[PDB]
Design a protein around this ligand. Structure first.
Ligand SMILES: *[C@@H]1O[C@H](CO)[C@@H](O[C@@H]2O[C@H](CO)[C@@H](O[C@@H]3O[C@H](CO[C@H]4O[C@H](CO)[C@@H](O)[C@H](O)[C@@H]4O)[C@@H](O)[C@H](O[C@H]4O[C@H](CO)[C@@H](O)[C@H](O)[C@@H]4O)[C@@H]3O)[C@H](O)[C@H]2NC(C)=O)[C@H](O)[C@H]1NC(C)=O
Ligand SMILES: *[C@@H]1O[C@H](CO[C@@H]2O[C@@H](C)[C@@H](O)[C@@H](O)[C@@H]2O)[C@@H](O[C@@H]2O[C@H](CO)[C@@H](O[C@@H]3O[C@H](CO)[C@@H](O)[C@H](O[C@H]4O[C@H](CO)[C@@H](O)[C@H](O)[C@@H]4O)[C@@H]3O)[C@H](O)[C@H]2NC(C)=O)[C@H](O)[C@H]1NC(C)=O
Ligand SMILES: *[C@@H]1O[C@H](CO)[C@@H](O[C@@H]2O[C@H](CO)[C@@H](O[C@@H]3O[C@H](CO)[C@@H](O)[C@H](O[C@H]4O[C@H](CO)[C@@H](O)[C@H](O)[C@@H]4O)[C@@H]3O)[C@H](O)[C@H]2NC(C)=O)[C@H](O)[C@H]1NC(C)=O
Ligand SMILES: *[C@@H]1O[C@H](CO)[C@@H](O[C@@H]2O[C@H](CO)[C@@H](O[C@@H]3O[C@H](CO)[C@@H](O)[C@H](O[C@H]4O[C@H](CO)[C@@H](O)[C@H](O)[C@@H]4O)[C@@H]3O)[C@H](O)[C@H]2NC(C)=O)[C@H](O)[C@H]1NC(C)=O
Length: 495
């Protein structure tokens, strides 16, 4: 039958068998729909034994109900029951195989959407599901709406233990490789249940994923900007937020994983350094409110920095590095003052020349997940003495007489090769500035000199890796030796 027997009493869409609810010290939120005047009793059971009971009622002209569970220790399985007591009649719904752990929401565009089927060494990564059954998966369906939705419209993959079949179901459909591998490495580390919720659509600018509030705070035009071929998907303000994120606001989370930016290369580019941090803040506010304060007011938000690829032919190439910079709030590293409790994975050395899905869809999502997982371990789980940032210049000295720029990095650096063009200097001379290459010259363990001899004026600024395609696969010029992390792109001014 198309209908169920019981219609008026059901859990909210994010609740189902085999799901994962956020662990201690937060309380799991359980909400759903019911008949007015009913009294709802949620009972958390471990087999035959009821461990926890919460009680609420469905107010007069409302049709929803919600309780907040007590904090729980990670593990399982558990069963969640809800009973609607409506005067003389009782109705119950039950979900089983429920786990408590860390809940991570994965969002972004096509590089998040890209699934385990399409990635490097796909067969092994799809078969090695045995040890990770406590990692649970849910993929949200592509739906768009012009107003915020209370519940999800549709779900492509319901809460499931990972299998070959649902990890790699078609192309750009079931379970991101990035989220899956991030959750897999996070489980390797934490050894307790992880829940991964994939809500992403390829070709989408950040405006689509932001609420009205953050967009207003950044002065995004209400009437959408003209868009290029880089914006292949839903672009209207908040259209994907309304339907694919907002329904989850009342759920208790560990954090968010983000892989977006490619479509903002030529859509409201110069606003990303506002809109992306705003979005983060906004979500933190909203999800904190929606979950009755259970989701941390400043929860971990980890994102991927754009990789090396070729953008579409009607975009100015410069947009790609600019977004990479805007993704850091124009500071080059995270966490920072504008983006606290955030972690980043540098991806510009993880390109793919032979990808059958386009340079923009690199097939090495494992290294991306590994670097994201370092960031998460450090920021989300406060792991100390763990390196998760690439080397960046902490001091820049100008030796004009020698024709040199001396860059002292906060980290030890490893120089693979002497690259002549990856660094650039702004030669300014009486109201005329121009960018020129600064070849790498001589280096020590923690510092590197660039040849500014080509500049006949003053050196105002220096930038590193300001290209759409700055490096070949793991053939960037600069890495931290111990951590094997690439030096991130940067723009610094000389004062
Ligand atoms: C997010 O990122 C964007 C882009 O990277 C930043 O936008 C730039 O911000 C800077 C600083 O505010 C702007 O630089 C200023 O430009 C003024 C004139 O701009 C006109 O002309 C340029 C082209 O030359 C156009 O692109 C622009 O639209 C305007 O039509 C100058 O007059 C300014 O000089 C004055 O300020 C400096 C200090 O800031 C003083 O030292 C000077 O003496 C002088 O008083 C300055 O150069 C730049 O124009 C902005 N770009 C754009 C496209 O708007 C955002 O600032 C950044 N936001 C955040 C939050 O990080
Ligand atoms: C509809 O639902 C309501 C709500 O309570 C529900 O029943 C529980 C059994 C459990 O499932 C809850 O999770 C759930 O919310 C029912 O109303 C309750 O009905 C039960 C029926 O057993 C009553 O239980 C009795 O309560 C007495 C006062 O607390 C107590 O003295 C009784 O103990 C005696 O009987 C038991 C049963 O053999 C025995 O084991 C004892 O040792 C002792 O002899 C018994 O516990 C609840 O009190 C009721 N509570 C309320 C608030 O009404 C309702 O029965 C159910 N069905 C309908 C409406 O058709
Ligand atoms: C999920 O989280 C969201 C975000 O926190 C949460 O939204 C909140 O919903 C409640 C309704 O349950 C809103 O509070 C109401 O707002 C309306 C509009 O102003 C008022 O009219 C309401 O008053 C009614 O109830 C009063 C007594 O309770 C009566 O005295 C009165 O006459 C009305 O009948 C009430 O103030 C609240 O504003 C939002 N919060 C935000 C931030 O939007 C939602 O409820 C959560 N649960 C879900 C989605 O299931
Ligand atoms: C970028 O600039 C930094 C400036 O901080 C520079 O690092 C400095 O390099 C100089 C030269 O290598 C260092 O000076 C040396 O310091 C050691 C420390 O004990 C001394 O032993 C050295 O003395 C010997 O060499 C002298 C001539 O340089 C002789 O006069 C002397 O008798 C000894 O033979 C010397 O003083 C300086 O310590 C560092 N400073 C830091 C903080 O590292 C760096 O080299 C520049 N980058 C590049 C690529 O050149």
């Amino acid at each position: 039958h198309h209908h169920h027997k019981l219609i008026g009493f059901r859990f909210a869409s994010y609740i189902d068998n085999y799901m994962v609810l956020q662990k201690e010290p937060a309380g799991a939120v359980i909400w759903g729909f019911g008949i007015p005047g009913a009294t709802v009793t949620v009972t958390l059971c471990q087999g035959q034994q009821a461990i926890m009971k919460k009680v609420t009622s469905v107010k007069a002209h409302t049709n929803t109900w919600m309780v907040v569970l007590d904090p729980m220790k990670p593990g399982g399985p558990y069963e969640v029951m809800a009973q609607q007591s409506l005067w003389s009649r009782n109705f119950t719904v039950q979900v089983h195989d429920v786990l408590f752990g860390d809940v991570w929401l994965c969002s972004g565009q096509s590089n998040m959407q890209m699934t385990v089927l399409q990635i490097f060494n796909a067969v092994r990564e799809l078969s090695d599901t045995a040890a990770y059954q406590s990692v649970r998966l849910l993929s949200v369906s592509l739906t768009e709406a012009e107003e915020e939705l209370q519940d999800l419209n549709a779900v492509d993959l319901q809460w499931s233990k990972p299998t070959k079949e649902n990890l790699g179901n078609g192309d750009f459909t079931y379970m991101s490789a990035v989220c899956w591998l991030f959750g897999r490495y996070l489980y390797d580390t934490l050894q307790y249940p992880i829940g991964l919720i994939s809500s992403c659509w390829g070709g989408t600018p950040i405006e689509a994923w932001s609420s009205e509030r953050s967009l207003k705070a950044c002065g995004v035009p209400t009437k959408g900007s003209l868009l290029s071929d880089s914006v292949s998907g839903p672009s209207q303000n908040s259209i994907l937020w309304n339907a694919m994120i907002h329904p989850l606001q009342n759920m208790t989370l560990k954090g968010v994983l983000w892989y977006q930016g490619e479509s903002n290369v030529n859509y409201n580019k110069d606003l990303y350094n506002c809109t992306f941090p705003a979005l983060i803040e906004d979500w933190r506010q909203t999800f904190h409110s929606g979950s009755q304060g259970q989701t941390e007011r400043v929860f971990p938000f980890g994102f991927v920095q754009l990789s090396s690829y070729l953008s579409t032919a009607d975009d100015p190439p410069v947009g790609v590095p600019q977004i990479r910079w805007h993704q850091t709030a124009d500071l080059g590293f995270v966490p920072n003052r504008r983006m606290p409790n955030t972690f980043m994975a540098v991806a510009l050395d993880l390109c793919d020349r032979t990808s059958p899905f386009g340079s923009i869809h690199p097939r090495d999502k494992q290294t991306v997940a590994y670097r994201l997982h370092l960031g998460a371990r450090a920021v989300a789980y406060g792991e100390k003495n763990l390196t998760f940032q690439g080397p960046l210049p902490e001091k820049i000295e100008l030796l004009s007489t020698d024709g040199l720029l001396n860059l002292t990095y906060h980290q030890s650096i490893q120089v693979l090769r002497q690259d002549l063009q990856i660094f650039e200097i702004s030669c300014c001379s009486d109201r005329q500035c121009k960018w020129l290459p600064a070849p790498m010259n001589t280096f020590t363990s923690q510092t590197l000199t660039l040849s500014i001899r080509s500049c006949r004026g003053t050196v105002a600024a220096v930038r590193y890796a300001w290209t759409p395609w700055p490096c070949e696969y793991k053939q960037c010029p600069l890495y931290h030796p111990s951590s094997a992390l690439p030096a991130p792109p940067f723009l610094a001014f000389i004062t």
